[PDB]
Amino acid sequence: MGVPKFFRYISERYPCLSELAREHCIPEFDNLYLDMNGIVHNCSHPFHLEEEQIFQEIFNYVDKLFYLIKPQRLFFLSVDGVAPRAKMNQQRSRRFRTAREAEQQEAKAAQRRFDSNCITPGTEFMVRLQEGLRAFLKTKISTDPLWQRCTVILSGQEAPGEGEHKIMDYIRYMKTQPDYDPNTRHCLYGLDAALIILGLCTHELHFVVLREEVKFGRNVKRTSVEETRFFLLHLGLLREYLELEFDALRTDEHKLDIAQLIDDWVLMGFLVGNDFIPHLPCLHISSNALPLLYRTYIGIYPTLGGNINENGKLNLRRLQIFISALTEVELDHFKEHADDDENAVLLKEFQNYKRNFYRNKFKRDPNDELIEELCHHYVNALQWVLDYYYRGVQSWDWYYPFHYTPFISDLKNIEQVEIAFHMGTPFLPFQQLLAVLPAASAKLLPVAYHDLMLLPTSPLAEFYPLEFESDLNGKKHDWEAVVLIPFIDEGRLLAAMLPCEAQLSLEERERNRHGPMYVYKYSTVAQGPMPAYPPLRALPVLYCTEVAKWSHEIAVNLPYSVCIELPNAARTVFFPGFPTMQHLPFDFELRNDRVKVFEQVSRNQNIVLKPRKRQLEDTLTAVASQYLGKVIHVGWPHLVKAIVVRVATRDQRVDSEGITLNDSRRFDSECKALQEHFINRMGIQFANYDVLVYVRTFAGNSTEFRDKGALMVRDSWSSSVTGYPAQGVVADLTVWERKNFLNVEHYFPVGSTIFLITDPYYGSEGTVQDPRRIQVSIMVRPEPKVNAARQLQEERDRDYLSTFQVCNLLRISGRTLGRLSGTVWVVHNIGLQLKYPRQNEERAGYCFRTNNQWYYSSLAVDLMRNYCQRYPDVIDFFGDSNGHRRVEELANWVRQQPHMKVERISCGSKTVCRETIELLIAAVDDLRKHVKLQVKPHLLIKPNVTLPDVYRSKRPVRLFDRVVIVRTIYMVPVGTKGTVIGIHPVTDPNPVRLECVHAVDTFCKVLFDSPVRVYKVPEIALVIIK
DNA sequence: TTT
Ligand SMILES: [Mg+2]
Structure with a gap:
């Protein structure tokens, strides 16, 4: 994987569309919309942690995301709540899957623990999480100055509706408001198709989609927060690329209606496959689906009155025409995978395939009545989804009641199809829970219905198969596999709940209500005390306000979709964050x-x-x-x-x-x-x-x-x-950019910190006293003697052999050294894992590369000798090569040893041994004078204002260099002083910015003397002490 | 929830 197949596809068909950027390249934003279920999943069950731990990490996640993206106006974080039946069916499928996959993987324990299905609403877990989250927002906003100019909105499991869709609703509600900014720059967390399509259909101009490259999980490779980068997609460009693709639809010398075109493209994207309907076998992205729907549409277009998807409403006639056209595609797919007048033969065999399919896989006889209700329910489905997006949920009850999709060829008389679903209402947590969970996770429900899940007497035993079959329509992975189960009838279900309901425990009874979302705004006025909550320590005084907003204070009731193209917006002008191909013919x-x-x-x-x-x-x-x-x-x-x-x-x-x-x-x-x-x-x-x-x-x-x-x-x-x-070169475009300082004193207020760039104390903490040159008091501090530690390291750096030398000492072929010292996968891993040539990594002191040649230290050699002594035949294999139990044996023997504990790092970076770190730490231990002076202003660093080019060293940073932090750096407060113990380059893998292509930024593993012990830190936030 |  690495990135969704959809993202990959449209990202390669339109190269300028997507990029991998770092903290500083991410454009400025007004609104960040954060979808939590992914995160909660990452933090809870990637081994053991307790709730306290998990919550702590989730909180962290959020903190670092908000820190990196800095949404100027709004921060909407949205946890999945109770969702419509349409989704619930699938949610349930995924639950059953995870329960069985769970038992199967636990079976390896038979060969020789945190239930995740609690990530659904109504579970005691998710409730505790909700609490801890409000507590977290309150603390963070109340204490952190960076969360104080923002408005924050939380939408928990309390409030019903998919996170991603509650976001959507708030967006439409937003567009509704009178004095709303048509230019607001939206950022939405996530990369899957649904979110692309979603943001694309908001018809918002400055809309970006993004997700970090690596789950924060690879922290065993020691990555600074500031080092993390994001995959991001520019919707603004996506639009222009579609305008490019359907250029053939132009008939005169003028632009097509992009609102119109986007709508129809949203439709195609929905056809490729969505959550709320079974996927059409003949449409997979890898399968060239988009191009095919494109061809079909273009070639069919002159014939439709206009749009198939008019402002979120369907045009059943035009739809009809389209589907009719898709028949070709479908039939061709059949003709392709058939084996795994000619045409006539094809069609007879295909109609036979149909009949036999309805019968066998649909367990229903092929009456025309069947085709009828299939067409009915499918068209209904489609319209339902479009409503979901363009107008908000239009039916909580409705659902596609089949497990497979219709045959396109067998979709005629769509136009006769009546669409009528009714709103109904979202289920109460426990109802949906019972609808979604499998027998396995009975525990997550209240005791009241445990019987219902597992007693074969149960009226609902049918819906709780111990064993459930699974069909895979030429879909390779078990997760793509259909999950053949019953569909719960709400009637019978609530019927089988009636008795238990009364008996529910009081707290269980209370936690079973729907709830609101909360709006936090920092307040200057003290709002009183807050109790602690695991793991948040308690707060003596809140400085923010929390305010309930219900689902209906966000409701937009209109005939048309507010997902229109706001004309107030300016698309002639350039916005710094957001590319357009428009300014160049x-x-x-x-x-x-x-x-x-x-x-x-x-x-x-x-x-x-x-x-x-x-x-x-x-x-x-x-x-x-x-x-x-x-x-x-x-x-x-x-x-x-x-x-x-x-x-x-x-x-x-x-x-x-x-x-x-x-x-x-x-x-x-x-x-x-x-x-x-x-x-x-x-x-x-x-x-x-x-x-x-x-x-x-x-x-x-x-x-x-x-x-x-x-x-x-x-x-x-x-x-x-x-x-x-x-x-x-594009010249003379106008741009929309946007608080100057006034007096010199305004720049340098009294008591503010100042850093020295003048020779006498380059890198000394200081404090402004009087703006007259400037009156300042510098706090001079001693500097540790490092010559000793340097000396220690130089000798160690001497301890290194060449690939050849090492080959001779071990009496092994060069090849075998190659396989042995790298990673070799057997099917399970059995390589000492010291070098990662492809990756361009090397392990600590063990391996190192310079003249495009490898060198191994002594620890490395004794290690490799060890490996050899113990496992000879394996080596013989490495050498002569181009019951399943011995593998696990050496795989573990390897995983156990301490080089695994030692950090792996990118080649070209200089590191240091724990012994030297000891000497240094001891020196600082051993170490434990305000001087007033008049200093020109341009040689004073104002911690978070001054541009880093004024203090960048004329000489590259070196080891043992004495560094201090200016620019604020996440965990580390400004002013913290330390010494370099690491120097690590970093280059963008595939910059789309020609300027970045070979640019190398420098991070320093730095040993601050104060605990706050060690942190990687960009060179931009550093001065060297001279 | 993702793949
Ligand atoms: Mg979602």
């Missing part, structure tokens, strides 16, 4: 250039964008004339502000200082580089690279200080200079 074509967006090269086609040859003559003097020294926007459509510092040609090149000659070789090389990037990753094709432009990316606003006189404010550019083809 370009042609386009769908080609087969094998673009590389993820790990490996795409196997299918993509859309190549081709900017039209610009009007500016492609000469040096001409390009310079226009753009030299000017402020432009490069990268496209992922635009950035930048200033042109040089223009170059294979022959010559212009600086502010005049024209000179240029290295042809180096130029042609740069050009190759650019070409490769754009085509292979960006699916972009410029006319030519005859003339390059070299820019500096905008790097923050800078405040200059003018003598004793005044405060100046200017633009700040970058350190590094990157090259961009002159053909992709």
Whole structure:
């Protein structure tokens, strides 16, 4: 996996659409919508933890997400509540699955614990979680200054409806409001198809979808918070890429109605497969589904009155036409996997396949009555889903009452289909629980119905099969497998609940009501005390307010869908976070250039964008004339502000200082580089690279200080200079950006912290006293002697052999050293796991790589010798190679030893041994003078304001360097001082930003003397003490 | 809940 198949697909068909970015590349947002069931799953059962632990970790998760994304206006976190029957059927399927998969995996314990099905609403678990969560919001917002300008909304298991859909509802409600901002930048947590489709159908302009790369789980690889990156999808581009795909639907010289088109595309996306209906065998993404629905639609389009999905409502005639068209696809799928006048033969065999299918797999006779009710229920289904999205739930009771899908060929007279579902109401937690849980998890229910789950007398015993069969329509994985069970009739079920209900325990009786969502807002006025809750410590005073809002204060009742295209919004202007391909006249074509967006090269086609040859003559003097020294926007459509510092040609090149000659070789090389990037990753094709432009990316606003006189404010550019083809330069666009300081004193208030950049105490803590130069008091502190520790390390660094040397000492082939020292999978792992060549990793002091050659330390060698001594035949195998019990034996022998306990790290990073760490720690132990001075303003770091380019060291950071923290860094408060014990580079795997492509950021495993002991920290938040 |  790594990422959903849908995400993967549309992400490769439109290369510019998605990226893997780090904390700082994520665009600014007003609203973050966080969906919790995923998280709760990650934290509860990835081995043992108690509730306290779990909650603590969930809380953490949230904290780090909010910390990294910094939603400026709203933070809506939404836990799945009691959902409509349509979903509940599937929820139930997944429960039964997990229960049985659970028993099966516990069976390995027979060969030789936290029930997860409690992640559903109504369970004592989820309730306790709800509590702890409100408590958490209250603490965080009440204490943390960063959660105080935000508005926060929680929607718990209390409030009914899928998290993702409660989010949706709040969004539509939002659009409804009068003085609502059409430009609000929405960020939604998640990558699966449903959330893409969802955000895409809100018809919101600045909407991003994102999820972290690695669950926070790989913390056994020591990753700083700031090091974590996100996969993100830009809906704004998705739109433009569809506008590109259906260009053939244009009949005149003018844009198609994108609202109209998006709607229909939402429809296709729903056809590919959704939760609330069985999937059509003939439509899987890997199976080229989207392209097929595209072809079908395009080729059918001139015939429909207009849209199949009009503003969330279906056009049964047009629908009909479409499905009719899909018949081809379906029949072709049949013709393909059949074996696992010709046509006529095909059709007879296919009709026979139908009959036999209805009979065998549908357990129903093929009466035309059957086709009838199948068509009925299917069309009903579709409309139901569209309502779910465009207008909110329109039926809590309704559900597709079959386990399989109709035959497209057998869908005629759709138009005659009557659609009528009724709202009804969401089930009470216990009802839904009994509807969803399998016999296995009876415990999660109150005692009152345990009997109902497990006593074969039970009226509902049918719905609780000890054994349930599973059909897999050519779907490979057990999870894709259909789960053949009954469908609960609400009647009989509530009938079999009547007696028990009264007898429920008091607290059980109380926890069985639906509930509201809560709105937290930081208050200056003290709101009183809060009790503690495992694991949140108690609070003497709250500084926030919690306020109940019910499901119906968010309700929008109208004939049309508010999921319309707000016209107040500005799509002419550029917003920094959000790319558009609009500002450049370009042609386009769908080609087969094998673009590389993820790990490996795409196997299918993509859309190549081709900017039209610009009007500016492609000469040096001409390009310079226009753009030299000017402020432009490069990268496209992922635009950035930048200033042109040089223009170059294979022959010559212009600086502010005049024209000179240029290295042809180096130029042609740069050009190759650019070409490769754009085509292979960006699916972009410029006319030519005859003339390059070299820019500096905008790097923050800078405040200059003018003598004793005044405060100046200017633009700040970058350190590094990157090259961009002159053909992709876009100039003079207007942008929507957006609190200046006033007095010098306003900048430097009394008692605020100041850091020194002047030689006498480069890196000294300080405090401003009087803005007159500036009056300041510096707190001088001693610095530990590290020469000793350095010395220790140098000798250890000496302890290293070469791959060959090591081959000789162990008397083994080079190959066998290769397999032995890496990871070798047997089917289970049996490699000492010291090096990870493909990954580009190395294990601590054991392995290390320099001249593209490997070197192993002594611990490594004694280890490898050990392995050899003990397990010879295995080695013999490694050497001569290109009851299942011995494996487990050595797999464990290996997993046990301590090199596993030692951190693995990326190659090119310098580390240190625990002994040296000991010496250092001892020195700091051993170590345990305010000086007033007048200091020019530009040599003072204001902790969270000053741009890091003013304090970046002219020399790369080194080990044992003495560092102090300026910029705030998650756990570590500013001011904390320490010494470097690690230096770790980091490069983006596949940057879509040409500027980032080979940029390496530096993190430092730092030993702060104070406990707060050790943390990786970006070089940006550091000064070195001179 | 995801794959
Ligand atoms: Mg969901």
